[PDB]
Amino acid sequence: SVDLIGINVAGAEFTGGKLPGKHGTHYFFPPEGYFEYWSEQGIHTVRFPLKWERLQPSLNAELDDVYASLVDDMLDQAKENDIKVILDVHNYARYRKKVIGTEDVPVSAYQDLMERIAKRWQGHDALFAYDIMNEPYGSADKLWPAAAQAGIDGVRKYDKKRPLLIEGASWSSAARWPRYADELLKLKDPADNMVFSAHVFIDEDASGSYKKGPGKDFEPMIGVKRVEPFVNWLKEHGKKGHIGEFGIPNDDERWLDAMDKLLAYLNENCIPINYWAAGPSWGNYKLSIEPKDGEKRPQVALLKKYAAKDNCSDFGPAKAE
C-alpha cells in the first residue's frame, strides 16, 4: 500500500544548464541492474526527479520522445524489481527560469504538462504517485497555490486514483510550514487522495549543505522539532502528509541518532519518508547512500530497520477519534 520508508533516485535532473543535454554526460537514468540492489535491501518506494524542460522542450506540446522514453525504461525496470515510483517534477515552480502564473508560463501550460504526464504513465503498474512540483520558492510562492490547483486538475483528467503529493512554499520547508500553508487549504482534489509533502534537513540553515558539523550544542531531537510544525498543521486541518526529502552526512554518529529519532516520530504518525538521496551518478556527494568504494552508508542500515516495521493503511497522521 503505502511504504513508510523510501529513497530518492536522483540524476535525471542534473546539469540544468544543458537543455536538452546528453544522457550519460549531463544527466543520468538508472542503468540495468540498478533497482536490484535497492529491492534486495528491502526498499520498495522511490521518488524520481525529472526536469520539465527535458520532458517538454516547448510548452503545450507533446513530451520529448527520447527523454520520456528513458522514463518509460526506468518505470519498466522498477516494475521488474518490485519498486513503486513517485514521479517528481523537479522544477521549483519555474519553466526556463520563469514562474508558473507569469505571462511566459501560464497556469494552463502547467496543467497541460500534468495532463501529459498522467496520460502517458497512468497505465504503468510501477507508478505510485505524482509529486507535482519540487520546492516552490521565492517569487513563485504567492502564485504557487493557484498553480498547484491547475496541476491537480491536469492529473485528475487522466488519473483519478493515485495520490497527489503537493509541496509547499519556501522550498516546502517543514519547519516553516504553518507560516504559509494556510493558502493551501483552498486546494481541492475530487478523488480525495491529496497528500502534502514537506522537506527537512538538520544542518544549521536546513538547506542540506551541511557546512558545519553537529556542533557542541547539538540536540538529538532537531529533526523531530523541525517536522512538528508540519505534522501539527496536518492534525489541526485534517490533512495527510509525507516527507519528500531528508538526508545526512555519513561522518558523524550524532546525525544518525537524530535521523533515528526523526524516523521514530514519522513512524508513530504514519508519515512516509524519501531519503535524499540515492542515484546512479552522485560521486562524492556527502548525502549519497549509493554504494561507493571506501564509503560506509550507515543511513541505509537505519532505513532497513524501519522498512521492516508494519506500514500504515494510508498516509497519516491518523484522524482524531
Numbering used by the authors: 1 to 321
Article passage:
RBcel1, an endoglucanase of the GH5_5 subfamily isolated from an uncultured bacterium, has aroused interest because of its ability to polymerize cellooligosaccharides in vitro under near-physiological conditions. After the glycosylation step, the donor sugar is covalently bound to the enzyme within its negatively numbered subsites. Transglycosylation occurs when a sugar hydroxyl group is used as an acceptor instead of a water molecule during the deglycosylation step.
The Tyr201Phe variant of RBcel1 retains transglycosylation activity, although it is reduced. The structure of the apo form of RBcel1_Y201F contains one monomer per asymmetric unit. A Tris molecule resides in the −1 subsite, as in the structure of RBcel1_WT.
